[PDB]
Amino acid sequence: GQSITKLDSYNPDTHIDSNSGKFLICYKCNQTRLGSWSHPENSRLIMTCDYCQTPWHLDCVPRASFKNLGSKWKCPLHSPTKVYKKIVNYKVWKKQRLINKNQLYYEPLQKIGYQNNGNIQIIPDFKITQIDENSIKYDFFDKIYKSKMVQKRK
C-alpha cells in the first residue's frame, strides 16, 4: 500500500492539502474525489504538478500512473519550451536557458512591435524582455484582428 503502490488501496486518501489541511482540488473537474473507506471505488487519483503545485486528476490529464520516477511531471498548464513549427520549415524555437543573476532585463517602451523571440518576464544578448500586462492584450487583439482582415484580403 505504499510507494508506486498508490494504486492498490484507498490507503492514500491523504490527497488532502498537507500544508493547509484543505482538499487538493483538480484544475479541470474542480473537485476532489475520495469517496469513503466504504466506497473506495468512488475515489479518483490526484497528483500535484512538480513545477507548479496545481493538483490534477489522473483521469483529467489522461494518465495511467503517478510519475514517482524519471523526470518531473509538468501540467498541461505551463508554457512550451520547444515550439516545433511547420510552415517543411521545421523551424525550432527554444526558450533561452536561465542565466546567472549576467542576466539583463532592459525595460521596454511597450505597445505593439517590440518583437521578442519568446522570452518574457511579466512585470506589473539573452535580454529577457519585460512585457507587463496590457501589451499582451493589445498584441493578441491586433494579431487576431489584422489576421482576420488579411483573410478578408484573400
Binding site: 508554457s79 512550451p80 518574457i120 511579466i122 499582451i136 498584441d139 493578441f140
Partner: peptide, 30 residues
C-alpha cells in the same frame, strides 16, 4: 466589450496568479 471582458474573466477562472502569468506567456508565444 467581449475583449475587455475575456482577460478579466480569465483572471478569475484561472485563479492562481502564477497560472495566469503562464497563460499570458503561452498567449505571447502566439
Amino acid at each position: 466589450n467581449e475583449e475587455v471582458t475575456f482577460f478579466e474573466k480569465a483572471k478569475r477562472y484561472i485563479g492562481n496568479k502564477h497560472l495566469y502569468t503562464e497563460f499570458l506567456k503561452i498567449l505571447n508565444l502566439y
